[PDB]
Design a protein around this ligand. Structure first.
Ligand SMILES: N#C[C@@H](O[C@@H]1O[C@H](CO)[C@@H](O)[C@H](O)[C@H]1O)c1ccc(O)cc1
Ligand SMILES: N#C[C@@H](O[C@@H]1O[C@H](CO)[C@@H](O)[C@H](O)[C@H]1O)c1ccc(O)cc1
Lengths: 487, 487
């Protein structure tokens, strides 16, 4: 693998003194303790326990990184690395086992996050809390289909309210949703992720949904929940320095050729990924291209919530992993959309017209290394969407572990270190070109449960040893980050 | 009126030695002799004779500029002005009174154009012939609704064939259609122009058409006719130096603000005007934006004709008069397209967001003076569509004559001269920036019948005196052009 020359390797003062460096996790992927201390089941419990064959290694998050119990080790590692901040998520059904206020607040759940938050702040690490990361209380699915019904909105905002009340005095940085596009397209469109729904004829666990309509329904409910939650926060919790936003996953998209049809395809593709959630919070409606394509499958916001939607963010999280080429597909009698993503009339190609991959594989099936893509997205944010305050809230890659990765080999994560150095170098170029980015969070602090891939992909800068009690060991990437942070 | 400074006034050698300067007319607008020498009625005869109240001054083209009889004066004026070329059109029903080959070729019709062509070439003026300028044989409308039926295609190509056979040995520059967008949207959409059709509830002479579907039907038939005609020409007539194309009218479109929604509106607007005809001849299909918006109202080309369509031009004519701002309209349950142009989801505003007109009025109801718009269109042609060889095949403006314009005042057309100088100055900037433009034709050589405006708008560089036998007198603009051409 070809590394950056020594003088091209980023140094901490490439970035402003106030810039944040951190790492990120999510509740289901690290916590474990899935049935402990009163916690209710989430969709991810239900999915792993009923459809184990839909996880590639038949694994689950019953234990994960055992962070419910081992959270003090999590904080120790962040401190030793010199991190300024930490993104973690709250487990909805750990706080409200039945999903609702009326089912009761689980105080053991609450105390857990309270201890975590206290420990981080005692060590000078600023918490950035994500309220929801795909782990809907299964009881809400039992009651009404969860995000498939507008009833979700009140339960979500009740949940957010509990979070703001219990933690808001100490936590000033909030994100309502994380990767809403992945959540909608992949949990309800291709059905890869819990609850695993898709159209008849699509291969997924529960092929009785509708890959053309459900992703939009769920997206719409989540956006209404977001607008309302931001309104609650602004009215009752923001005060002098509180901030709330959301974190979007954005694939970079490069026109397959520099020809108008493929440029137009790239634009529809960006609209269908970034614009789907960003344009609603920025201007109060979905991108024109999405409506004109999918028509009555895209719902309309009501007047009052629409006013709440517009500008409903203090900052936007960008989670960036990779890019593809976007190639035009003609509208013809021969093309009939199957998945919501087909509404973009574009194919996403990993190989360009000269036969070359966009960039090299980093290990897993989809993350190709293309740091220039981040620059393209940030210039779009800066020039098209008003340059809001941004955080790279996730950036990382997975090492494959199919049972023959010796720990010593796992610790020498040179590919990951190169990946991180190169994205930081591009990020420096973006900030110098005026993009308002204020921090960077590696995905992930810990090797963890990588959804349908189970434990076969390790994304951590810290190794979690499943054969040794989930003991943590800094990888070389974490050691580099420690030197970089001057710690 | 504020004129260019003397050193900013264009001189002939601003332009290449091989560059062409000319003027243009069309058959119905200048010829008169509407029922003479065997000529059949066109739709424009029929419209003026049945719906005189739909011409603002209740006038018609029975005589027009009397150019069927006075054509030798037309040629004299072109020669004295030093013009290199002349664009005129052939009257379909003057060549085939019944519209069809089977109804017979009108030899008196043929001899007329033959004399005109001989006289031009004797005087060193290159003819650029337009085959069709909106004057469909009324007999074809009687037989099958003319352009509303695919039967038009064979009759048109038969007509084109007669033209190529009779004139092609001496004429090497052909244009199949002129302003196909105006022809479709305005004759079948707003119904202002013959045959005056529109949807019930739209104000026009024959409000029993459909302003949402007929413009597309007619456009589609004209494009199929074009592809087939170019194929005939290339196979049997082109030889070593023959050239065939078409001339498109293009409004400049400026985004109402430099904001993504209005930029997107500007792009849809350009697609709906320029791209509607240019993208078919360039790539073999309509712009994506037009299909995704109007769906089943836009027909599909067949495989074989589509192959003929792609690249079916040696040069593209640009007829440019004016620009507007294009402002975004949202797709909502409240918006329902009435006219085909509503499919662009954009309003065309003559006033921008600061309250200023895009440019000043030149006289009539729609031509605002905005020469920078031509530059924008030419850069689009150069950068987006491959920079094909281009001619400004029309450019001009009208002086209002409602019966109180003394001839001496009409001759001092300073507004027109300023308009021409300023567009030539912008054209110089475009050519210097690499646009492949090879000539410029003023609309019009002669004051003429300006369609629904009748004789109330004079567009000529040469005055045609209706009170003095249609005698011709060069206006100041023509005198400037004469000095410019060094003649
Ligand atoms: N985009 C994306 C992926 O998810 C986000 O990135 C992490 C690495 O994949 C993941 O662990 C994290 O939870 C997410 O924020 C993604 C993951 C899985 C599937 O099927 C699609 C996308
Ligand atoms: N665009 C346009 C107008 O037509 C073209 O320009 C000339 C001046 O208007 C006209 O005389 C010529 O025949 C055309 O090539 C146009 C004219 C009338 C109406 O109603 C709409 C557009």
């Amino acid at each position: 693998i070809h590394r950056l020359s020594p003088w091209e390797i980023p140094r901490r003062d490439w970035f402003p003194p106030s810039f944040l460096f951190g790492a990120a996790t999510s509740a289901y992927q690290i916590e474990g303790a899935w049935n402990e201390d009163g916690k209710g089941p989430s969709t991810w419990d239900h999915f792993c326990h009923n459809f184990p064959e839909w996880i590639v290694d038949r694994s689950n998050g019953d234990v994960a990184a055992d962070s419910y119990h081992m959270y003090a080790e999590d904080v120790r590692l962040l401190k030793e690395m010199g991190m300024d901040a930490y993104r973690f998520s709250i487990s909805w059904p750990r706080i409200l086992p039945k999903g609702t206020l009326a089912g009761g607040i689980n105080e053991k759940g609450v105390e857990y996050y309270n201890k975590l938050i206290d420990l981080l702040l005692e060590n000078g690490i600023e918490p950035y809390i994500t309220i929801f990361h795909w782990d809907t209380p299964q009881a809400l699915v039992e009651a009404y289909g969860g995000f498939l019904d507008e009833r979700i909105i009140k339960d979500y905002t009740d949940f957010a309210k509990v979070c703001f009340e219990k933690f808001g005095k100490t936590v000033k940085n909030w994100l309502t949703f994380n990767d809403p596009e992945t959540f909608c397209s992949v949990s309800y469109g291709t059905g890869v992720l819990a609850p695993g729904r898709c159209s008849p004829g699509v291969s997924c666990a529960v092929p009785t949904g509708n890959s053309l309509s459900e992703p939009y329904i769920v997206a719409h409910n989540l956006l209404r929940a977001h607008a309302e939650t931001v309104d609650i926060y602004n009215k009752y919790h923001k005060g002098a320095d509180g901030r709330i936003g959301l974190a979007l996953n954005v694939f970079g998209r490069v026109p397959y050729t520099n020809t108008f049809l493929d440029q137009q395809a790239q634009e529809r593709s960006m609209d269908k990924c970034l614009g789907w959630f960003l344009e609603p919070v920025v201007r109060g409606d979905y991108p024109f291209s999405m409506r004109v394509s999918a028509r009555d499958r895209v719902p309309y916001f009501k007047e009052k919530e629409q006013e709440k939607l517009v500008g409903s963010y203090d900052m936007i999280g960008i989670n960036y992993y990779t890019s593809t080429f976007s190639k035009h597909i003609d509208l013809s009698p021969n093309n009939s959309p199957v998945l919501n993503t087909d509404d973009a009339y574009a194919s996403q190609e990993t190989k360009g017209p000269d036969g070359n991959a966009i960039g090299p594989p980093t290990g897993n099936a989809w993350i190709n290394m293309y740091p220039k893509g981040l620059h393209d997205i940030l210039m779009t944010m800066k020039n098209k969407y008003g340059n809001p305050p941004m955080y790279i809230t996730e950036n990382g890659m997975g090492d494959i572990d199919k049972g023959d990765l010796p720990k010593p080999v796992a610790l020498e994560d040179h590919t990951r270190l190169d990946y991180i150095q190169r994205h930081l170098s591009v990020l420096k170029q973006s900030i110098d070109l005026g993009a308002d980015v204020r921090g960077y969070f590696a995905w992930s602090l810990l090797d963890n449960f990588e959804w349908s891939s189970g434990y076969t992909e390790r994304f951590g800068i810290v190794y979690v040893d499943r054969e040794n009690g989930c003991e943590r060991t800094m990888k070389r990437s974490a050691r580099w980050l420690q030197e970089f942070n001057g710690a």
